[PDB]
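pinging the channel bc i need a second pair of eyes. not urgent but kinda urgent?? the chain im working w is below, pasted from the shared doc
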Amino acid sequence: VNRSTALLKSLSAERERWEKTSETFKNQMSTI
């Protein structure tokens, strides 16, 4: 089950990318 585990952890890192993007993006949503 380590193949799906590797897929899951890579997806979790890519989702970390998503939440950092959402943070900065609510930032300009605030300053608009």
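so Residues 2-31 form the longest helix (30 residues). and The CA atoms of residues 3 and 32 lie 43 Å apart. — does that match what u expected or am i reading it wrong
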